[PDB]
Amino acid sequence: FRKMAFPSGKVEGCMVQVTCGTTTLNGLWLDDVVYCPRHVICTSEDMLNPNYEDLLIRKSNHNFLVQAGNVQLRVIGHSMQNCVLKLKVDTANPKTPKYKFVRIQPGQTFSVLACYNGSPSGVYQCAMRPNFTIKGSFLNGSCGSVGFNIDYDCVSFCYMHHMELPTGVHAGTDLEGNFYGPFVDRQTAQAAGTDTTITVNVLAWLYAAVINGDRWFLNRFTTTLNDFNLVAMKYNYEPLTQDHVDILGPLSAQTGIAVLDMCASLKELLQNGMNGRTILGSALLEDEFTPFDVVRQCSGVTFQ
Amino acid sequence: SGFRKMAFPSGKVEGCMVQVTCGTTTLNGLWLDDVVYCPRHVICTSEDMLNPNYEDLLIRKSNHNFLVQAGNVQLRVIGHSMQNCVLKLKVDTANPKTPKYKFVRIQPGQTFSVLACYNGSPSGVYQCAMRPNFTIKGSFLNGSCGSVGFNIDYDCVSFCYMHHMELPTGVHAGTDLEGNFYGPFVDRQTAQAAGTDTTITVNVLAWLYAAVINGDRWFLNRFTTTLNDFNLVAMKYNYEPLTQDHVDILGPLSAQTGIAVLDMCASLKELLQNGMNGRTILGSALLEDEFTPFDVVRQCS
Numbered sequence: 001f002r003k004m005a006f007p008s009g010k011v012e013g014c015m016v017q018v019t020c021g022t023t024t025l026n027g028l029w030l031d032d033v034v035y036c037p038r039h040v041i042c043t044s045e046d047m048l049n050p051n052y053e054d055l056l057i058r059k060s061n062h063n064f065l066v067q068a069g070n071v072q073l074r075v076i077g078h079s080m081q082n083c084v085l086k087l088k089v090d091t092a093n094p095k096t097p098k099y100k101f102v103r104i105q106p107g108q109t110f111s112v113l114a115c116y117n118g119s120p121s122g123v124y125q126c127a128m129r130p131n132f133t134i135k136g137s138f139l140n141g142s143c144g145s146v147g148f149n150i151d152y153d154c155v156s157f158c159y160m161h162h163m164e165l166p167t168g169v170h171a172g173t174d175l176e177g178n179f180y181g182p183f184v185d186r187q188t189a190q191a192a193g194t195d196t197t198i199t200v201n202v203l204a205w206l207y208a209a210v211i212n213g214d215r216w217f218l219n220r221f222t223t224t225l226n227d228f229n230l231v232a233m234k235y236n237y238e239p240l241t242q243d244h245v246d247i248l249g250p251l252s253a254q255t256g257i258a259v260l261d262m263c264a265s266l267k268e269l270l271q272n273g274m275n276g277r278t279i280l281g282s283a284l285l286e287d288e289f290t291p292f293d294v295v296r297q298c299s300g301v302t303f304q
Numbered sequence: 305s306g307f308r309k310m311a312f313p314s315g316k317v318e319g320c321m322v323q324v325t326c327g328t329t330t331l332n333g334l335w336l337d338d339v340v341y342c343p344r345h346v347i348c349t350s351e352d353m354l355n356p357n358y359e360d361l362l363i364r365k366s367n368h369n370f371l372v373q374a375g376n377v378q379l380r381v382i383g384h385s386m387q388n389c390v391l392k393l394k395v396d397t398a399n400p401k402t403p404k405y406k407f408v409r410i411q412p413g414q415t416f417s418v419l420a421c422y423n424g425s426p427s428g429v430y431q432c433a434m435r436p437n438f439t440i441k442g443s444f445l446n447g448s449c450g451s452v453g454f455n456i457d458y459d460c461v462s463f464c465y466m467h468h469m470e471l472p473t474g475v476h477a478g479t480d481l482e483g484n485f486y487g488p489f490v491d492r493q494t495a496q497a498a499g500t501d502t503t504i505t506v507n508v509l510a511w512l513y514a515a516v517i518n519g520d521r522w523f524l525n526r527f528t529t530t531l532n533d534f535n536l537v538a539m540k541y542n543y544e545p546l547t548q549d550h551v552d553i554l555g556p557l558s559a560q561t562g563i564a565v566l567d568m569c570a571s572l573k574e575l576l577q578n579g580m581n582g583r584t585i586l587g588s589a590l591l592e593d594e595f596t597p598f599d600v601v602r603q604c605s
């Protein structure tokens with residue numbers, strides 16, 4: 001089991017450059033619309049608290065330079081939806097994959113295609129933290145890079161990059177321009193809420209350990225969900241939702257270990273330590289691998 | 305800012321991946337212009353795999369014994385040859401998506417991106433390193449043979465690896481694109497052990513510089529060391545030797561952080577001798593050796 005990105009080719013064919021003034025960032029070209037962060041229309045003397053509505057009144061179609069490589073795509077319409085700008089262009093992208101826009105929950109993972117000037121430079125796997133930040137890797141000019149999942153041949157876009165926070169973590173929106181968490185696209189220092197450990201993913205990691213025959217931590221206890229949730233929060237663990245219980249179903253069926261029995265096993269690991277031992281080679285409990293991520297990597301048949 | 309294990313965008317390689325089938329065996333091939341490259345053991349039955357005479361099995365095959373599929377269309381095989389452990393299938397169609405490319409043989413300690421494929425379908429991408437014992441710590445399942453490793457520079461894809469084998473310890477072995485294995489391994493169905501692995505010293509130091517660039521300095525000290533005395537301790541702890549070339553390649557990271565290379569060596573020596581004492585570096589409880597100096601500069605500058 002390993003942290004793996006989705007192949008990025010379907011997304012690479014969608015990356016473009018958007019320039020307004022001397023500010024260049026990345027945009028996402030799907031059919032005849034280009035999606036990008038709206039702060040591309042900001043000047044260096046106006047980022048502190050931009051009035052985006054009045055800044056955009058000042059802009060016409062001909063103020064936007066959209067480029068696929070060095071090839072210009074003429075902008076024939078523009079609008080703002082929350083914190084994203086939607087630029088209608090004169091050319092439908094022939095590389096447009098089958099796609100959806102989706103808003104992910106904390107704990108869900110996705111691949112990020114980090115881009116600069118519309119040129120992809122790297123791909124890595126991220127998790128949405130419970131405080132709605134991501135521990136990403138972004139340099140200047142990265143805004144507009146997107147995060148995504150791929151299921152069969154459909155790309156589910158879930159993240160567009162906008163901000164770095166003082167602590168070095170990152171914040172952004174879904175593809176309707178709505179920020180994850182309490183952040184705003186302003187040139188200010190914004191504090192992330194206090195983070196927690198992603199319980200459902202820890203449990204997925206324990207199931208993965210069991211699947212591999214590493215199962216010393218399986219105890220003889222069970223628990224109710226409410227009892228577990230109340231203890232978990234005292235160790236800075238997220239509480240479990242009904243949806244979390246249900247996405248652990250397949251792993252519970254595969255191993256024969258009831259979800260609530262594994263919760264009792266995790267509770268013991270929180271109240272005592274690992275003694276000295278490790279799980280899957282590590283002394284730390286991994287929390288950025290989802291139940292889906294574990295199920296996929298069990299065999300070639302499921303991973304394809 | 306930030307630090308992640310980062311792979312190269314895989315789109316240029318995705319357009320080259322195909323499915324090759326011989327009899328009951330299916331794996332992946334690499335389609336460049338009008339040739340498909342794939343592991344030669346695709347021609348083996350489960351009988352053959354135990355002790356294949358590969359020249360033996362191949363002369364008994366004809367072109368129509370090979371079924372090559374690219375996405376949804378069959379490519380017709382019109383020629384076949386063998387170069388070391390790779391098969392070269394000539395097909396009657398050029399791959400329009402052929403990128404600019406080169407075949408390279410990489411050195412131990414260097415990194416590359418792996419595009420893991422199953423039945424010709426790319427399914428994940430991750431970053432690996434060629435270990436000093438010429439294994440790779442991959443994640444490969446059944447059907448993954450013929451997946452390739454690569455680096456990209458501008459628009460040119462440098463293919464350095466094609467996947468063939470898993471060892472009993474769970475690490476992996478494979479060839480360059482000329483079909484020559486990395487390390488002492490062979491394409492037969494036997495349990496094979498590697499030589500004793502060592503830690504890639506120059507990469508650990510690059511990673512420590514990354515940790516400093518990202519604001520973490522707890523492991524630094526005011527000691528220094530000579531290069532030879534550092535190498536004495538490194539060899540004691542199963543680390544590869546650090547050469548003057550390594551010291552030079554660390555130059556840019558040293559200049560960026562203001563920490564002389566031999567001072568960082570002194571930090572690493574202390575970490576080797578004292579342990580990490582339950583602390584973390586870039587979220588890791590272990591010293592990480594699969595980031596090269598170039599990888600760190602690329603991601604942190």
Ligand SMILES: *C(=O)[C@H](C[C@@H]1CCNC1=O)NC(=O)[C@H](CCCC)NC(=O)/C=C/c1ccccc1
Pocket residue numbers: 025039042047138139140141142143144162163164165166170185186187188189190305
């Ligand atoms: C977009 O390219 C950029 C991404 C940053 C660059 C460095 N790493 C990243 O992730 N986004 C911004 O720079 C953003 C624009 C603000 C809209 C007008 N500004 C910030 O992210 C600054 C945050 C900050 C942190 C601490 C103190 C002040 C400001």
Ligand SMILES: *C(=O)[C@H](C[C@@H]1CCNC1=O)NC(=O)[C@H](CCCC)NC(=O)/C=C/c1ccccc1
Pocket residue numbers: 331345348353444445446447448449450468469470471472476491492493494495496
């Ligand atoms: C090709 O797809 C496959 C890749 C393996 C499958 C599981 N994970 C991988 O990386 N390659 C083989 O299966 C290879 C075929 C070569 C014989 C012609 N055989 C092995 O890798 C055998 C390993 C082994 C381990 C222990 C004891 C015997 C054999």
